[PDB]
Amino acid sequence: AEPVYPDQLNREEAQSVKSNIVGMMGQWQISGLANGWVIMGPGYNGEIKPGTASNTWCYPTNPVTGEIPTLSALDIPDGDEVDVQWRLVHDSANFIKPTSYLAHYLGYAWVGGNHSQYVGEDMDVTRDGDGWVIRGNNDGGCDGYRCGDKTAIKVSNFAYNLDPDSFKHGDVTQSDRQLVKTVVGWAVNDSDTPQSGYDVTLRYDTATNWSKTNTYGLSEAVTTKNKFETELSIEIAANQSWASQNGGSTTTSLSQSVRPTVPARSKIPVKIELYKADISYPYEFKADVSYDLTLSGFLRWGGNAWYTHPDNRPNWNHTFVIGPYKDKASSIRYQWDKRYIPGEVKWWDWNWTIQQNGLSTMQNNLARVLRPVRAGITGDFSAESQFAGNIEIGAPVPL
Amino acid sequence: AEPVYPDQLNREEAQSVKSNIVGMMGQWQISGLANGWVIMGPGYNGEIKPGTASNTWCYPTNPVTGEIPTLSALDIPDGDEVDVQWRLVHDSANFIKPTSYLAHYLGYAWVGGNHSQYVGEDMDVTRDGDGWVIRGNNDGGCDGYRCGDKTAIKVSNFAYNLDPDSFKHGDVTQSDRQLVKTVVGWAVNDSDTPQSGYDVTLRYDTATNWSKTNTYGLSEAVTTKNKFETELSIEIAANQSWASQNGGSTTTSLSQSVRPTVPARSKIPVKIELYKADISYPYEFKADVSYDLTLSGFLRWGGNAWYTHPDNRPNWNHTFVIGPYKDKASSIRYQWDKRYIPGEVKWWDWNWTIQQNGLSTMQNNLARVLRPVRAGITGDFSAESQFAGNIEIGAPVPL
């Protein structure tokens, strides 16, 4: 009838979340529900049958949805892309601690450095290629099984959601200009009315292609020979062959046209030019910063949140998208909202994290992890071997 | 929290520039910072731990950004491209000395001639192909290890940023004209209204292509023969083959059309012609002159600014772009502004140059190297085997 969330705890509603109810009770115990039905615990394999007992299950008269709250946006002082990234990853209260706690709650081992006993303390930050890496400091020494195998938090693939009325760009400059082709010409009007029916068009195209082929074959031959000085021989033969091909191509095209309106009893000159050149220009906008978050390290033997709950301390890697929806495996909100359907629990078990830490705890942590970020952006565009053109209509000459 | 620039000198802020702080202190020394944390010097490998000591690190209460200043533009008397280049490279106060000092500060050996002891003096200037070369004069003799291996400063790849309302061009002339094709025709209107539904179009296309193929193969055969006068033999065989192809093409197209409006009960004649010809014309504009600067010579054993600090006197080459941003390796402003992030110091160490010469010194030198230049330009366009066309609508004839 209604969706039921196990953290809040009808024969059907009981069946819909059967494995959660059966998990949360003693072996050989029996507890009741509506209309004379009872749930049997482990050892009876969770069987639901008509019956009676001295314990019962029941929902709150007024239960809650348990959704992740939305916080106000975090404003980062303006700059270029790398400066804004620097300011985000070095913020311990708004970035480093919430992310460390998320990794800890999901079951990643050793989230922290050697100079503190607390989660998220004593972390080092470094720049690595186009991304950033946050890991606990490992100077001196530690004490614990595999205590030198720290969990790493990796940040990459930043993207920007612009505000439509904020974008601006500056001067466009060109360098290393090379000529492709030019055309010049005249449009002549010896009639008594204006004429607009003229057209000159110049077009340039380039393309590439590839192909691969596999061939297989068989043949059979029979020869009979008779040496009557004179030998006479006759050969009969046949063959079969099969072949298979795959391929493809890519094409780029650039066209320019001119269509002048010419006054009566007059003529107009025209010109079109095409070059290749490198293009550069500055820009600015205001936007929201989204990114990919990857957690990497071995999981804990005493318990973790992976839905198969492995116990051999495997090394683990998983990527979440902090921002708009792309996919199910990488969406925290998708997985949180659907925790009432056992058939979709394919990645992380969020019911387990609620049981271990409390509902308010998990809600506040996830709200901080998913908080929006605002920042101003300045930057520079640059590209090699692009196109540049020029189309001209000149002044008329009376005939 | 905040970016910290080492020339101006929190446990995190301390970690963000750890290698600069540790470099700038004595082995086995320990100095303090905020909230009970201390930095250990070389020999402790820079370890940051809780503790105490008799020395401390601290930032200025009011530190500076240290950005490179912008100077007013240098005006060069007008001419053509080569005359303006000549005037730029022969200016010792605005060009030769600042560039020589930049090469000297980065660690290039022997920047100067044999008739002076000062940097940038006694330099010769020569024209070489499409560029210019500036090098210290090596007449007579010198005194020093490899003192005859002078550092060279090379200038090439000039580009112009026009002022939109300044461009003008003159007469367009043609020579070596060869006919491609012509068409003539009539548009006839025997209706009682004007008609504009007429079209004649002439189009000419040319193209080239190429392709390469690699093929490999295997075969196996078995023959049985029996010589019962009569020999009978039977052959069974099979084969396999694999092939791979790559290719491409280029196409150029030029089209011309005519669409006349014809009065009622009248006719109009039309004509289209297409030629190949060489095209020439004069031009003028006002613009800014940008260029590529290349430094070439062996580096100094006692210290240089390359980030790996090599000590075997290698021969070195590096190109900077003086002008708008293209890339990171060739941008002085990009590298200067990001000197607070150790993970991006991949080319020249600008913190090292500041430590060796002072901050005001480096700022003034780089401001002079990057100063804008304004100049007027006159010139001539020339190209072979271009297109030229002519489209004509004639006077009407009553029917």
Residue numbers in the entry:
A (entry chain A), B (entry chain B): 1 to 9, 27 to 245, 252 to 422
What text comes from the article?
We have recently demonstrated that the K238A mutation enhances the sensing capabilities and sensitivity due to a longer dwell time of the analyte in the pore. To unravel the structural basis for this improved performance, we have solved the structure of the K238A mutant in SMALP obtaining a density map at 2.2 Å. The structures of the WT and mutant in SMALP are highly similar, exhibiting an RMSD of 0.92 Å and comparable pore cavities shown both from the raw structure and in MD simulations. Upon closer examination of the mutant structure, it becomes evident that the K238A mutation induces widening of the third constriction ring. This is attributed to the substitution of lysines with smaller alanine residue. In contrast to previous suggestions that the K238A mutation alters the analyte dwell time by decreasing the diameter of the constriction formed by R220,13 these structures reveal that all other constriction rings remain unaffected. Notably, for this mutant, we did observe a narrower water density from the MD simulation at R220, which is the same as previous MD results. The new structures indicate that the K238A mutation may influence the pore’s rigidity as it disrupts salt–bridge interactions between K238 and E258 within the barrel. A comparison of the ionic current response to different voltages revealed that the MD simulations in DPhPC bilayers based on the new K238A aerolysin structure solved in SMALPs yielded results that very closely aligned with the experimental data and are better than previous estimations, especially when negative voltage is applied.
Aerolysin is a β-pore-forming toxin produced by most Aeromonas bacteria, which has attracted large attention in the field of nanopore sensing due to its narrow and charged pore lumen. Pore-forming toxins (PFTs) are important virulence factors of many pathogenic bacteria, which are secreted in a soluble form and upon host membrane binding, they oligomerize into transmembrane pores undergoing a complex structural reorganization. Domains 3 and 4 form the 120 Å long 14-stranded β-barrel, with each protomer contributing two antiparallel β-strands. Four distinct constriction rings, two at each end of the pore, were identified from the structures and confirmed by MD simulation.
